[PDB]
Design brief:
The structure is cut from a larger assembly and holds chains A (78 residues) and B (74 residues). In chain A, helix 1 crosses helix 2. Chain A is rod-shaped and about 95 Å long. Helices cover 47% and strands 0% of the residues of chain A. With 78 residues, chain A is mainly α. The longest helix of chain A has 26 residues. Chain B has 74 residues and is mainly alpha-helical. Classes of the chains: A mainly alpha (78), B mainly alpha (74). The interface between A and B is small, with 11 and 9 residues. The structure holds 1,2-Distearoyl-sn-glycerophosphoethanolamine. The site of 1,2-Distearoyl-sn-glycerophosphoethanolamine has 4 residues of chain B, from helix 1. Chain A: This is NADH-ubiquinone oxidoreductase 9.5 kDa subunit.
């Protein structure tokens, strides 16, 4: 009656869809995630869809030496 | 059980159908399972009852029908 997967995988996948849909389609939906992770990113960058830059979550401290600024000194206060 | 004499013609049931003999499409069978289809029909049938006149009468201002033969107090 019920097929065995390792004997006939396709006849099993048909039986699993018709007779045990909630369990079988859980595996499809769940497996669709790692398929999404492997195919969407390459094609997105293919079509120029560019991942955005990370938004600042801490003050961005500039690198390099200080710029030796002249202006806004104590005399300018008055 | 069955009548004596020749057994009823085709009284024996046909042999059982297997899972892969049911001639319903997977898209229909799975759709009906997940979409709760038959029970949406029942929900809809209640909706058209909702828009039908009620049967109710306002007793005692309205009375249900009784015949000349009706048997009440003596
Ligand atoms: C929005 C518009 C609708 C708004 C109104 C919603 C309906 C409100 C109705 C009242 C609340 C719901 C009542 C639920 C009644 C169904 C139920 O509980 O029956 C249990 C039933 C038993 O299932 P079982 O015995 O295991 O399998 C064979 C069944 N002959 O189990 C079942 O029959 C299965 C019920 C399936 C419900 C799962 C949710 C469906 C949503 C899609 C799931 C997505 C994952 C699948 C992806 C699709 C794959 C092709």
């Amino acid at each position: 009656t019920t097929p065995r997967f390792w004997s006939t995988p396709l006849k099993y996948c048909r039986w699993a869809a018709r007779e045990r849909p909630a369990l079988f389609f859980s595996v499809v939906i769940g497996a669709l995630g790692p398929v999404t992770l492997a195919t969407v990113p390459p094609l997105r960058r293919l079509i120029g869809d560019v991942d955005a830059a990370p938004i600042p979550l801490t003050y961005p401290i500039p690198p390099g030496p200080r710029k030796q600024l002249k202006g806004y000194d104590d005399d300018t206060e008055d | 059980a069955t009548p004596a004499g020749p057994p009823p013609k085709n009284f024996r049931l046909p042999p059982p159908k297997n899972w892969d003999e049911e001639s319903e499409s997977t898209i229909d069978k799975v759709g009906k399972y997940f979409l709760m289809t038959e029970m949406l029909r029942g929900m809809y049938v209640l909706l058209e009852q909702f828009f039908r006149p009620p049967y109710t009468i306002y007793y005692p201002f309205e009375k249900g029908p009784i015949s000349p033969r009706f048997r009440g107090e003596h």
